[PDB]
Amino acid sequence: SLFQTTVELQGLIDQINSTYVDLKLLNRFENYIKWPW
């Protein structure tokens, strides 16, 4: 039971890590390029 819980938690951590990386990358990309495009 503890192993299954930890595996699910690790999958969730990986997903959240990837999604925050993507969101921060999108924010930096929108800051990098000019506005009126």
Next chain:
Amino acid sequence: SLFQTTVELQGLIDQINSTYVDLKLLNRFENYIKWPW
């Protein structure tokens, strides 16, 4: 073991929740200020 798992989960939640606050602050700031520079 359960205390360690709960501590890891709480540490994850704190980072998630602070990241959500940080993202929403930037979103609100960008909503307040008009797009043109």
